[PDB]
Amino acid sequence: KRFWPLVPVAINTVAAGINLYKAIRRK
């Protein structure tokens, strides 16, 4: 939507949080 600060990359820092439980529970 015209100039994307961290909209398309939000899944790089926000995804880590959601995929942290299984990550730290199945490394």
Q: What is the DSSP letter of 4?
A: -
Q: What is the DSSP letter of 26?
A: -
Instruction: Please give the tally of structural domains in the chain.
Output: 1
Host domain of residue 13: 1-27
The experimental technique behind this entry is NMR
Cα separation, 17 vs 23, whole angstroms = 10
The tokens for 20 are 């942290």
What is the residue whose two structure tokens read 């299984």?
A: 22
The tokens for 24 are 């730290």
- Contact at 8 Å (CB) between 1 and 7? yes
